[PDB]
């Protein structure tokens, strides 16, 4: 085999991370989806969680009763503002600390006050509810999101969908330095007079990327293919004309970078005034939550309401769907090749794949843990 | 792990009985569903059987041809009153002894008279067709049904449904001594003026149950929680009023018991003039046949026709469905927790679970065999 | 059991051939389904292939890009007559030799010209496109089809359907002499005055079959039960009248034979003026492509157009479906019994099964390889 072991050695941990990285923050829902006193069940990294907002504060608990292991969310019953009672025998837990404070069906039980559901640390920023999945004290959320995502003046809006592919197919697709070819028919092209070449003739391999590995700040890789190559706007087949790219006035996706636990930052995009952020949150081994966020620097309540309107009325359908919908096929089609780990050894990479290789190495070395099941 | 082994030790056989107990009688269909010369296929304990009534007598044979292993019931063909002929090559077997008595496609075959389909002992009582699944001589049916079920004066009617959970989830749910909380919204409460607390404050653990262990009579456990506890009608959470039970003049479920191979007896229920009997017949590892029978002592053919009409016009929708429908969620929600055996070790039981523990111990020690595949 | 090992010894390879035999020709589609410049994906023996007709010539290549392993046919894109370009990063391959001749997204890539998709030898005869699946040089197509199928004067037409069963269930069912019992109610019987018995009373087991194993020509088995038995047109059950066959004046299925890699020849059928040929091409372990071809010796372009018309207007619904639709249930019902290999040991065969046994032995000894999937 190895030949293959030597080639994949530096990313063995990544190859094993079918369920994602443990001990990191992950966004799971939009703020508006988690309303006051209205529990919402979610699943991430194979773990079933139940969310709820109490007095404006979002709380997260394991979505499973400690008694007979039923799923609490199968029939949500709350009889006090701060608690949820299991629908089977009334074991009652607090949302803030998961403690079993009462048992409606037997107030004399010696089990009362002796147990607690697992709770997940929560952070709600930029219209997203983030959960920390791990066993160690959480580090700052800033270390798990792209640089600038938490900037005070950055207005953010987004949407999410479930993709039938492992989360890694999402990140591989998202940070793939030379895949613009798949977007050559996007309505966003002439819809926003954006320039989109067919591909790139890469320069020196050592110049194509830059990695950030310091402590106290997000760790990731910058894709520098753009400034170190000759954009391809026309290509031939066996010497004959075959196809052309799409030249336009606006140059976007000037700075592309990916960060642990696996979040993309495309700047500027889909317009010189916007920045796109993407997450590929693991749900289970065969699915991921593809979260697409668009941000715009705002200086007043007025230009904020303005961006909000432009987001829903234009960008969602023109870009988030009009441009990115073609990415889903890529993820679904690569899925089977990599689902059994064979792809990591059999793939035949070329020049523009240097960036993903650097991401695989960095992710393998700096992730805070490999999520596993039982 | 060692603490788990010691705790589950007395019921390890039960943990392995995913397919039920072998060498016991099991009801599979209502008498009316097995009509004269109208073969009906069934599956119990993972075994596929074909039933038919010939001259009033119900017969049961393995639902698989000895030749090429096809399922006989895929296309039932009978060319003589006493036989069934496989639809593929005409191997012909007698219903009464499973004997290969003819081969329509080759009357001179040396195989004729040299083989026989497996046959299952049958007993038809109280409108139910019972099959003995096992290799030893059948003991009396009375030993596998609750006390009184076969009383000459008991008029019986019932219905069944397939539940998406292991049979043990059905029995655990049925004999769960303190689960009335799940039935607090049943239309039966107001519908039949039945009292229903939210739970119970159990007395001495040693007084909560009584076990009966053969020989020559059904073996099972009596749930004595009602007699040794304080009914819980008012529930609180952290000192504040949370929810309340329901008052009624009719007292039901005075006596609850479960018997091997796994049948419940609730008396009286759902009315002082009735008794409910429940079976959780294993179909395969993930499904069971939930059989609900209601019995009423009758003294004349007049009050028999009366009970029959009441059963259909009132009790089926008011109780069998109106009360027990909420039980299905419980079985389905516990299913995954116990399907991989981890639930038996990870569950956190409390006081009212003494009864189910006594059942698991009794079932483990006295079952006549563990049904397996291969 | 040692008894089972000894019994199945002579056909152990056949038992392992769940995916079919490697190094043989297999028909995959009708010529009309593979049009000029209109790529069509197919799957045989677990391998995904992409077909296309360029300048009237059919080409076949592996349906998977060498780059990231996506399925090319998920979005066919051709920018030059002789090539196909992957929809993801534009790697471009020639249909005739699978060579990676260009990479639209990076014309300077060092990978260009250093790789080639696997190609499959192709043969197009009698309105069918045959593919050779193997690693060795292809032998003559004539060695993998029934005798006379390629005769110059044989006009051929047919249809195919995917069947939910392993390919062997198709061959087993096809070359089975006692199976005519399943066809006793076929509309073809009265519809064409066909004489179809219920079964047969075979003679010496030694003259029931004849094998052909010479080199240079197809290898197979001739079913000689007909010319060596007493056909059963009426049969009794326990001495009493039970069922009758279907006498007629048109004699068909006079000569039945099966040939490697697994193709049946029934002559004449479904009419004295026709010959039926059937293929059971493995798709994957649980499905096969059931190809039904009808041939008629023709001497003029007029009777050729006449047969073509009769095929469409009469034989398709009266025989291909009217007669063979019943064979499908047989294959599906046997499927589970043999899917886990238990069937080969537990089946109880009788006299007329001598023919299938001869096929299993011949197929085991002469197949050119067992197809396997890592
Ligand atoms: S399973 Fe939740 S209170 Fe019993
Ligand atoms: S499979 Fe039943 S008679 Fe042949
Ligand atoms: S996956 Fe086909 S060119 Fe990249
Ligand atoms: Fe899915
Ligand atoms: Fe993309
Ligand atoms: Fe099911
Ligand atoms: Fe209940
Ligand atoms: Fe299928
Ligand atoms: Fe047939």
UniProtKB/TrEMBL annotation, chains A, B, C:
[2Fe-2S] cluster binds at residues 65, 67-68, 86, 89, 91. Fe(2+) 1 binds at residues 164, 287. Keywords: 2Fe-2S, Dioxygenase, Iron, Iron-sulfur, Metal-binding, Oxidoreductase, Plasmid. CDD domains: RHO_alpha_C_DMO-like (cd08878), Rieske_RO_Alpha_OMO_CARDO (cd03548). Residues 25-131 form the Rieske domain. InterPro entries: Cholesterol_7-desaturase, Homotrim_ring_OHase_catalytic, Rieske_2Fe-2S, Rieske_2Fe-2S_sf. Pfam families: Aromatic_hydrox, Rieske. The keyword Iron applies. The keyword Cell membrane does not apply. Fe(2+) 2 binds at residues 179, 183, 327. Gene3D superfamilies: 2.20.25.10, 2.20.25.680, Naphthalene 1,2-dioxygenase Alpha Subunit, Chain A, domain 1. GO terms for molecular function: 2 iron, 2 sulfur cluster binding; dioxygenase activity; metal ion binding. PANTHER family: 3-KETOSTEROID-9-ALPHA-MONOOXYGENASE, OXYGENASE COMPONENT (PTHR21266:SF60), IRON-SULFUR DOMAIN CONTAINING PROTEIN (PTHR21266). This is Terminal oxygenase component of carbazole 1,9a-dioxygenase. It comes from Novosphingobium sp. (strain KA1).
